[PDB]
Nucleic acid binder design. Structure first.
Ligand SMILES: *[C@@H]1O[C@H](CO)[C@@H](O[C@@H]2O[C@H](CO)[C@@H](O)[C@H](O)[C@H]2NC(C)=O)[C@H](O)[C@H]1NC(C)=O
Ligand SMILES: *[C@@H]1O[C@H](CO)[C@@H](O[C@@H]2O[C@H](CO)[C@@H](O)[C@H](O)[C@H]2NC(C)=O)[C@H](O)[C@H]1NC(C)=O
Ligand SMILES: *[C@@H]1O[C@H](CO)[C@@H](O[C@@H]2O[C@H](CO)[C@@H](O)[C@H](O)[C@H]2NC(C)=O)[C@H](O)[C@H]1NC(C)=O
Ligand SMILES: *[C@@H]1O[C@H](CO)[C@@H](O[C@@H]2O[C@H](CO)[C@@H](O)[C@H](O)[C@H]2NC(C)=O)[C@H](O)[C@H]1NC(C)=O
Ligand SMILES: *[C@@H]1O[C@H](CO)[C@@H](O[C@@H]2O[C@H](CO)[C@@H](O)[C@H](O)[C@H]2NC(C)=O)[C@H](O)[C@H]1NC(C)=O
Ligand SMILES: *[C@@H]1O[C@H](CO)[C@@H](O[C@@H]2O[C@H](CO)[C@@H](O)[C@H](O)[C@H]2NC(C)=O)[C@H](O)[C@H]1NC(C)=O
Ligand code: NAG
Ligand code: NAG
Ligand code: NAG
Ligand code: NAG
Ligand code: NAG
Ligand code: NAG
Ligand code: NAG
Ligand code: NAG
Ligand code: NAG
Ligand code: NAG
Ligand code: NAG
Ligand code: NAG
Ligand code: NAG
Ligand code: NAG
Ligand code: NAG
Ligand code: NAG
Ligand code: NAG
Ligand code: NAG
Ligand code: NAG
Ligand code: NAG
Lengths: 709, 709
RNA sequence: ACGGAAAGACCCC
RNA sequence: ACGGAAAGACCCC
C-alpha cells in the first residue's frame, strides 16, 4: 500500500498527487493507484499523449488535473468510462487543435483549456458535454470566432465562456443563439467591432471587451443583450457616442477605465449623456487618468452610484472642495494609486452612507484634524502604502463604526495609548510592515472588540509590560518577522481568550539550560495554535518549563529552526496537542535533541512531522505512547532501517512517510518491505520507487530477494 | 601528523587550539603536540589541577591560556621549563589562594588571575616573576590589601596592578614604595578612605577609585602620588572639599561622574574651587545628572578643557543659550544619553576648535537651520539613536571639514540627492539600521572622497539606477541585511575602486536557469571580497554568468545559503580567487550542486571550505586542479571514505580537515589512515580522535586492524 | 505573506 | 554587528 510515482493525500485517501515526477508515460504512472480514487492531480510533468483508454480502472474520478504538461495529442476515447468527472484541467499544454476526444464525459461541468496554442475546435468536439457549464479558452491562438461558435452553440448547459487573451478581430454574422450563457469575455483580444446583431444572448449578464487594441470601435450593437448587468470596456478605445442607453437599461455596473494614463481625461459631457440614462447603474469603475476633481463634480450630477472606483487618477493631488457631495448615495469609494497628498472635511461632507473607503498607495504623509469625521458610518478604511510616519489622532475623530483599519506598509515609526481611542468597534487592525520598534503599555487599551491584530514585519525589539491590555476579545495575534527575544512577566496579560499566537522568525533563543521564573505563555489559557518557527539562530535550548499553562494547545510549530533542543519534559503540559511539527533543522544530532520520553503525554497527537532533519537513527520507544498518531512523517532524513520496533503500538497509524531516506536493501528491512506493501491500513508515499542504496542502483527496495535471510 | 584533543591553527602551525573539548587531564591532552608549539589555548575545559611539570615538552611556549576551567590547584613546579612564556591566562577558574608556583616563569610579562575567588597570595608567590609588567586580580574576593602589597612590592618590573571588583575596604598603613607602578585600580571595591600616606607611588600616572559605594569618603590624601595624571572617581562619593589641588598639579584628566542619576547635581562652587586650580587639566568626564546647563556655564569659567564629557546629564533638554561660549578651547564634546530635544547654533557659537561631537542617544526629532554651522572644524559627528525620520539639510550648512558621520539606528525613512551636499570631505557614512526602503539616484553624488558607506539593516528593496553615482573613491559598501534581489543594469557602475561588497542576508535568489543580460558585478574592477551569504531562500540557481568581470576577486563568501546551485562554469572568471567558502547549506544533494569541472580555473585558490553541507560523497577529479590549495576543509559532513582519488594532485596542501565526518573503520580507509598518520606535510585536525562508526563506539580509526586488507 | 506544509521545489510563461 | 569562520558552539557569570 504505496504506489510508485503518485501518493495519496494524508487527510483524504481519495485524493492522489503525482506532482513534479518527470512523468512521461501516463498509463504506467497511474497503473498502481486505487480504483476508489476521486481526485487525481498530475500537474507539472512531461506527458505528451493521451491514449484511447487512459483511465479505464479509474471511473470514480471526479477531478482530473493535467495542468502544465506537454500534451498535444488526445486520442478519441481518451476519457471513456469517466462518467462522474466534473472538472477537467488541461491548462498549459501543447494543444493546437481540439478534436472529438470527449466521449464519456457526461457529467463534466468545467473544462479548462487555458494557456495552450488552440486555433480550431472541431464542430462536434463538445457533443458529449451535456452538463458543461464553464469553458475556459483564455490564452490561446484563436482568431476565427465563427468556428468557436459552431463548437459551442449547441451546448445545453454552457453558462460561462472565456476567450480572454486571444486574437479575435471580428464577431460572427450568421444568426445564432446561446441561451444558457451568462458570462462572456473577449478581454485582451483585438476586436474591431462590438456588433452583436446575429448573436442572441438572452441570458447574458456579464460581458467584457476590455483591452482590445489600438483601433477605435464605432460599430456597436447591444440590443440583443437585454439582460446585461455589467459591461467592461476597461482599456478599450470605444467611441462612446455609439453606445446607446436604450440598449443598456438593465446595466448595473460599467467599467470605462483607460488602458494607460497617456490616453487622458474622458469628455464628461459624452460620459454623462450615456450614464445619466441608465437607471439601474450603481457601480462605475473609472480608472487611469480618466478624470480630475472637477469632472467628479460633473459625474455626481449624471448619476446615483453605490460604488465608485477612481483608482489611478494621477491628476487627483488634493480633494478639499465638496467633490463628492452630490453623491450621497455612495457606499464604497476607491481612491487608491492616485497622487493624493491632501484630503479633508470638505470633500466628503455628505457621504453619511459610505461604509468602505480605500486611500491606499498615495502620497499621504498626514491628514488634518477631523478629516474623516463626516464618515460616521465607515466600516472599512485603508491607508496602506502611504508615507505616513505618525498618526494624527484627530483625523479619525468620531469613526465609531469602524470595524477594520488597514495601515500595512506605511512608514509608521511610533504609536501609543492615544492612537486608537476613536475605534471602539474595531475588529481587525493591520499594522504590518511598518517601522515600529517598541510597543508602549496601553497602546491598544481602547480596542475592546479587537479580534485580529497584525504587527508582523516591523522592527519590534521591546514590548513593554501590558502592551496588550484591554484586548480581552483578541483571537489572533501576529508578531512574525520581528526581533523579539525575551518575554516580560506580564507581556501576554489581557489575552485570556487568544486562540492563535504567531511568533515565528524572531530571535527567541536560549543559549543555556533555563527554568523561567515566568513561563511566557502561562496566561494564554485558550491558546490553540502557537508558531515558533525559524528563530534566527534557532530557539536552541528550550527552557524546561517553556510550555507551562498550555493545556488547550492543539498545534505547535517549531519547524525551520537551525536548532531545537528539548532535553527534558517540555511537552508534558500539552495534553490536548493534535499536531506537532519540528521539521527542517537539517542536521540531526547537532541541530535536534528530543528526550527519550518527550512524547509520553501526547496521547491525543494525530500528526507528527519530523522531516528534513537528516536523522540517522530512531530513539527506541520514543513513539510508543502515541496511540492516536495517524500521520507520521520522517520524509527527507537519513534513516537506513525501519522495523516493528519503531512502529510499536501506533494503533491509529494510516500515513507513514519515509520517502527521501536511505533504506537499505538488506534483511534488516525485510519486515518493513513486506508489511509496507501489504498493510491496507497504512499508506506509504512513493514506496514502490524507493531505491536500493547500492551505488549501481537500477534496483528497488520493492524487489528485494526475500530468499537470502 | 594529527592530534587527539587539539589542533593546529590553519595559518600558523605554532598555534595550537584545544577549545571546548571537555579536557580534564591536562598532561594527557597535550602529550601529542609538537615541541615547536608557541601558542597554546586550552580555554573552555574542566582541568582541575596542574601537576609539577605540566609543560615539560613545551618549553617554546610564549602564550598560554587556561581560561574558563576548574583549576583550584597549581602545584609547585607546574610551569617549570617555561622560560620563554610572556603571557599566562588563568582567568575564570576556581583559585582561592595563590601559592608558590611560578618557578621558571622568568620572562612572564603579563599574568591574568581575574575572575577567580582569590583571598590571599603567599608573600613569595611572585618572586620568580622578574619581568612581570601587568598583573590582573580583578573579580576576586580580596579584602586584605596589606597581604597583596606583601606579594607585589618587591616585583622589579611591575607597572600595572588591577584590583577592580574586589572587597578592599581600607588601605595599608605601613610606609612602603612601589616605584615602578604607573597604573593602579581599586574600581568597584568598598574603600572607606583614600589615604595614601603609607604608600609611595612616585611614578603613578593613573589611579581609579571609581565605584566604591555610597559611604562618603572624607579621608583623602594624595601628596604621595606626585606624578598622577588621571584620577578616576566615577560613582564614588568623596567630600570634594577634602581633595587638595596642591597635591594634584600634574593632573590632566579627572572623572567626577555620579553613580546614579538620583545623587543629583554637584555643588559647582566646590567643583570649581578644585578644578580652577589644576593648571594642566584638559579632560573632564562629568556624567549622570551631575550638572545642568547653567552649571556648564560656571564650569566654563573654572576651566580650560580640550575634552568635556557631559553624557547622561538628564536635565539637559535644550541648549540654546551660549552654554559653551566660554570654552572655545574644546576639541571634543560628548552630550550623549541626555534628554536633548533641541539644540541650535547659539550654544556653541565660539567652538571653532571642536573636531569631535557626540549627540547620540538623545531625543532629537530634528535640528533647526544652521544648528551645526559654527563648527567649521568638526571632523566627527555622531547622531546615532535619535528618533530622526528625516534630515534637515540646512542644519549641516558648512560642515565642510566633516570626515565621519554616524546616523546608525536613527529612524531615517528617506534620503535623496539633497541630503549630503554639505560634506565634501566625508570619508565614512554610517546609515545602518535606519528605515530606508529605497535609494534614489544621485543620493551620494557630492561625497567625492567617500571611502566607506554602511547601509546595512535597512529595508532596502529598490535601488534606483545611479544610486551610487559619484562614489568614485568608494572602497567598502555594506548592504547586508536588506531585501535586495535584482539589480539595475548599471547599478554597480562607477565603483571601479570598490574593494569590498557585502550583499549577504538579502533575497538574492534565482528559481530557474538564467544567463543575465547584465551581470551586476561586471564593472567592479578592483573588487577583492564579495559577500553573498545567507540569502533568505538561498541564492539557489546561480546564473551562468553571475561572476563575470571579477578577475580581481580574492575572496568569495557563499556560505549559510539554504541552497547554492552552480551547474555550469560560474567560477571561470575568478582567476585570482584565493579563498572560497560554500559552507552551511546543510543537506548535500538537495541544497548543493557543483559542476564536475567547476574548479578548473581556480589555479590560485589557497583556501576551500565546504563545511556543514552533509555531503555523502566526493565527485571524482573535482579538486584535481587546485595546485595552490593549502587549506581544504570538509568539516561536518557525512563522508564515509576518503582515499588517494580525492587528494590527487594537491601539491601545496598543508591542512585537510575531515573532522566531524563518518569515516569507516574498513579497508576502504586503509590508504587514508596510513597517509594521514604519516604525512608531515599535511595536518589533519583531531585525527587521533576519529571514532569507528559502530554504534557501540569505544574504538578509533587510528587503531585499525590492517590485517585483512 | 515563498509566512509554500497536499513542502524541500532548477518553480518556466 | 552571534555579521562568531582560529565556526557549528547547551556559549555559564
Ligand atoms: C492537485 O489537485 C488537488 C485536488 O485534486 C488540489 O487540491 C486543493 O488544494 C488546496 C490547497 O492546496 C485546498 O485548499 C483545496 O481545497 C483543494 N481542492 C480540492 C478539490 O481538494 C491540489 O492543491 C493540487 N496541487 C497542486 C500542487 O497542483
Ligand atoms: C474589467 O476587466 C479588467 C481587465 O481585466 C479587470 O481588471 C482586473 O481586476 C482584478 C480585480 O480587481 C485585478 O486583480 C486584476 O489585476 C485586473 N487585471 C488587469 C489586467 O488590470 C476589471 O476588474 C474589470 N472590471 C470590473 C468592474 O469587473
Ligand atoms: C442611506 O442608506 C439608507 C439605509 O440602507 C437608505 O435608506 C433605505 O432605503 C431603502 C430604499 O429606499 C428603504 O426601504 C429603507 O427603509 C431605508 N432605510 C432607512 C433607515 O430609512 C438611504 O436611502 C440611503 N441614503 C441615500 C442618500 O441614498
Ligand atoms: C586561543 O588563543 C589564541 C592565541 O593563542 C587566540 O588567538 C587570537 O585570535 C584573534 C581572532 O580570534 C586574533 O585577531 C588574534 O591575533 C589572536 N591572538 C594571538 C596571540 O594569536 C584565540 O582567539 C583563542 N581562542 C579562543 C576561542 O579563546
Ligand atoms: C566589575 O563589575 C562590574 C559590575 O558588575 C562589571 O560590569 C558590568 O559588566 C557586565 C558583564 O558584561 C554587564 O552585563 C553589565 O551591564 C555591567 N554593569 C555595569 C554596572 O557596568 C565590570 O565589567 C567588572 N569589571 C571587570 C574589569 O571585571
Ligand atoms: C573611570 O571609570 C569608569 C567607571 O568604571 C569608566 O567607565 C567605563 O568606561 C568604558 C569606556 O567608556 C566603558 O566601555 C564601560 O562601559 C564603563 N564601565 C563602567 C562600569 O561604567 C571610565 O571610562 C573611567 N574614566 C576615565 C576618564 O577613563
Ligand atoms: C499621467 C498623465 O499622462 N497625465 C495626463 C496628462 O499628460 C494629459 O495632459 C491629460 C490629458 O487629459 O491627462 C493627464
Ligand atoms: C485541558 C483542556 O483544555 N481540554 C479541553 C477541555 O477543556 C474541554 O472540556 C474539551 C471539550 O469539552 O476539550 C478539551
Ligand atoms: C507506456 O508504457 C507502456 C508499458 O510498457 C507501453 O506499452 C506504452 O507504449 C507506453 N506509452 C507511451 C506513451 O509511450
Ligand atoms: C484494470 O484492472 C484489472 C484488474 O486488476 C487489470 O488486470 C488490468 O490490467 C487493469 N488495466 C490496466 C490497463 O491497468
Ligand atoms: C487533433 O488532430 C490533429 C490532426 O490529426 C492533430 O494534429 C492534433 O494533435 C489533434 N489534437 C489533439 C490535442 O488531440
Ligand atoms: C491576459 O494577458 C495579460 C498580459 O499578459 C496577463 O497579464 C493576464 O494575466 C492574462 N489573463 C489570462 C486569463 O490569461
Ligand atoms: C458580473 O457582474 C456583477 C455586477 O452586475 C458583478 O458583481 C460580478 O462580479 C460579475 N461577475 C464576474 C465574474 O465578472
Ligand atoms: C484646497 O487646497 C488648495 C491648496 O492647498 C487651496 O489653495 C484651496 O484654497 C483649497 N480649497 C478650499 C476651498 O478650501
Ligand atoms: C471639518 O474640518 C474643520 C477644520 O479642520 C473642523 O473644524 C470641523 O469640525 C470639520 N467638520 C466636521 C463636521 O467634521
Ligand atoms: C592523567 O593521565 C596520566 C597518564 O594516563 C596519569 O599518570 C595522571 O596521573 C593523570 N593526571 C591526573 C591529574 O589525574
Ligand atoms: C616528552 O618527550 C619525551 C621524549 O620524546 C618522552 O619520552 C616523554 O614521555 C615526554 N614526556 C611527557 C610527560 O609527555
Ligand atoms: C626562547 O626565545 C628566544 C628568542 O627568540 C629563542 O631564540 C630561543 O630559542 C627560545 N628558546 C626556547 C626555550 O625555545
Ligand atoms: C594553595 O594551597 C592551599 C592550602 O594548602 C590549597 O588549598 C590550594 O589548593 C592551593 N592553591 C593553588 C591555586 O594551588
Ligand atoms: C593617613 O594615614 C596616616 C597613618 O598612615 C595618618 O597619620 C594620617 O592622619 C592620615 N592622613 C589623613 C589626611 O587623615
Ligand atoms: C591613563 O591616563 C591617560 C590620561 O592621562 C589616558 O589617556 C589613558 O587612557 C589611561 N590609561 C588607562 C588604562 O586608563
Ligand atoms: C537630577 O538631580 C536633580 C537635583 O539636582 C533631581 O531633582 C533629579 O531627580 C535628578 N534626576 C534624576 C533622573 O534623578
Ligand atoms: C531656548 O528654548 C526654549 C524652549 O524652546 C525657550 O523657551 C527659551 O526661551 C529659549 N531660550 C533662548 C535663550 O533663546
Ligand atoms: C584653537 O586651536 C589652535 C590650533 O591648534 C590653537 O593654536 C589655538 O590656541 C586654539 N584656540 C583656543 C582658544 O584654544
Ligand atoms: C544661527 O541660526 C539662526 C536661525 O537659524 C540663523 O538665522 C543664523 O544665521 C545662524 N547663525 C550662524 C552664525 O550660524
Ligand atoms: C590578479 O593577480 C595578478 C598577480 O597578483 C595581478 O597582477 C593582476 O592585476 C590580477 N588580475 C586581475 C584580473 O585583476
Amino acid at each position: 500500500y504505496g504506489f510508485n510515482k503518485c501518493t495519496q493525500y494524508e487527510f483524504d485517501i481519495h485524493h492522489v498527487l503525482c506532482i513534479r515526477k518527470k512523468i512521461t508515460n501516463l498509463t504506467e504512472a497511474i497503473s498502481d493507484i486505487p480504483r476508489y480514487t476521486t481526485h487525481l492531480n498530475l500537474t507539472h510533468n512531461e506527458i505528451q499523449v493521451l491514449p484511447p483508454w487512459s483511465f479505464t480502472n479509474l471511473s470514480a474520478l471526479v477531478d482530473l488535473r493535467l495542468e502544465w504538461n506537454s500534451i498535444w495529442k488526445i486520442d478519441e476515447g481518451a476519457f471513456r468510462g469517466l462518467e462522474n468527472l466534473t472538472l477537467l484541467n488541461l491548462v498549459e499544454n501543447k494543444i493546437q487543435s481540439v478534436n472529438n476526444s470527449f466521449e464519456g464525459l457526461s457529467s463534466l461541468k468545467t473544462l479548462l483549456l487555458s494557456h495552450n496554442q488552440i486555433t480550431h475546435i472541431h464542430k462536434d468536439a463538445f457533443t458529449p458535454l451535456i452538463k458543461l457549464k464553464y469553458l475556459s479558452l483564455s490564452r490561446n491562438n484563436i482568431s476565427d470566432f465563427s468556428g468557436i461558435l459552431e463548437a459551442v452553440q449547441h451546448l445545453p448547459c454552457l453558462e460561462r465562456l472565456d476567450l480572454t487573451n486571444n486574437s479575435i478581430m471580428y464577431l460572427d454574422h450568421s444568426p445564432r443563439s446561446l441561451v444558457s450563457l451568462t458570462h462572456l469575455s473577449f478581454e485582451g483580444n483585438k476586436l474591431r467591432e462590438l456588433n452583436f446583431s446575429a448573436l442572441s444572448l438572452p441570458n447574458l449578464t456579464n460581458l467584457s471587451a476590455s483591452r482590445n487594441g489600438n483601433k477605435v470601435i464605432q460599430n456597436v450593437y447591444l440590443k440583443t443583450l437585454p439582460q446585461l448587468k455589467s459591461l467592461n470596456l476597461s482599456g478599450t478605445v470605444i467611441k462612446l457616442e455609439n453606445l446607446s442607453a436604450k440598449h443598456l437599461q438593465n446595466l448595473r455596473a460599467m467599467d470605462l477605465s483607460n488602458w494607460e494614463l497617456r490616453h487622458g481625461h474622458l469628455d464628461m459631457k459624452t460620459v454623462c449623456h450615456l450614464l445619466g440614462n441608465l437607471p439601474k447603474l450603481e457601480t462605475l469603475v473609472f480608472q487611469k487618468n480618466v478624470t480630475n476633481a472637477e469632472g467628479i463634480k460633473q459625474l455626481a450630477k449624471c448619476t446615483r452610484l453605490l460604488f465608485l472606483d477612481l483608482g489611478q487618477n494621477s491628476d487627483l493631488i488634493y480633494l478639499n472642495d465638496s467633490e463628492f457631495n452630490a453623491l450621497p448615495s455612495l457606499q464604497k469609494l476607491n481612491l487608491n494609486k492616485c497622487q493624493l497628498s491632501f484630503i479633508n472635511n470638505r470633500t466628503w461632507s455628505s457621504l453619511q452612507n459610505l461604509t468602505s473607503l480605500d486611500l491606499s498607495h498615495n502620497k499621504f504623509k498626514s491628514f488634518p484634524d477631523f478629516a474623516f469625521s463626516p464618515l460616521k458610518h465607515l466600516e472599512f478604511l485603508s491607508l496602506s502604502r502611504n508615507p505616513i510616519t505618525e498618526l494624527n489622532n484627530l483625523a479619525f475623530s468620531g469613526l465609531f463604526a469602524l470595524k477594520e483599519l488597514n495601515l500595512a506598509a506605511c512608514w509608521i515609526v511610533t504609536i501609543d495609548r492615544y492612537s486608537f481611542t476613536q475605534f471602539p468597534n474595531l475588529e481587525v487592525l493591520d499594522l504590518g510592515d511598518n517601522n515600529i520598534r517598541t510597543l508602549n503599555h496601553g497602546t491598544f487599551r481602547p480596542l475592546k472588540k479587537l479580534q485580529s491584530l497584525i504587527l508582523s514585519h516591523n522592527c519590534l525589539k521591546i514590548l513593554e509590560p501590558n502592551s496588550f491590555s484591554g484586548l480581552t476579545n483578541l483571537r489572533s495575534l501576529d508578531l512574525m518577522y520581528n526581533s523579539l527575544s525575551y518575554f516580560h512577566e506580564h507581556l501576554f496579560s489581557g489575552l485570556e481568550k487568544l486562540l492563535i499566537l504567531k511568533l515565528g522568525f524572531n530571535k527567541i533563543t536560549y543559549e543555556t539550560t533555563r527554568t523561567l521564573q515566568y513561563p511566557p505563555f502561562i496566561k494564554l489559557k485558550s491558546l490553540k495554535q502557537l508558531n515558533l518557527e525559524g528563530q534566527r539562530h534557532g530557539i536552541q535550548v528550550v527552557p524546561s518549563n517553556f510550555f507551562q499553562g498550555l493545556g488547550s494547545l492543539q498545534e505547535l510549530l517549531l519547524g525551520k529552526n537551525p536548532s531545537v533542543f528539548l532535553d527534558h519534559h517540555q511537552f508534558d503540559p500539552l495534553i490536548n496537542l493534535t499536531k506537532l511539527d519540528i521539521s527542517g533543522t537539517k542536521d540531526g544530532d547537532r541541530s535536534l535533541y528530543l528526550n527519550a520520553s518527550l512524547f509520553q503525554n501526547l496521547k491525543r497527537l494525530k500528526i507528527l512531522r519530523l522531516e528534513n532533519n537528516n536523522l540517522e537513527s530512531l530513539v527506541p520507544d520514543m513513539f510508543s505512547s502515541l496511540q492516536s498518531l495517524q500521520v507520521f512523517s520522517l520524509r527527507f532524513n537519513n534513516l537506513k532501517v525501519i522495523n516493528q520496533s519503531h512502529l510499536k503500538n501506533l494503533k491509529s497509524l494510516m500515513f507513514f512517510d519515509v520517502y527521501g531516506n536511505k533504506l537499505q536493501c538488506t534483511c534488516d528491512n525485510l519486515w518493513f518491505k513486506n508489511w509496507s506493501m501489504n498493510t491496507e491500513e497504512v499508506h506509504i508515499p512513493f514506496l514502490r520507487s524507493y531505491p536500493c542504496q547500492q551505488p549501481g542502483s537500477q534496483s528497488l527496495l520493492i524487489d528485494f530477494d526475500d530468499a537470502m535471510c
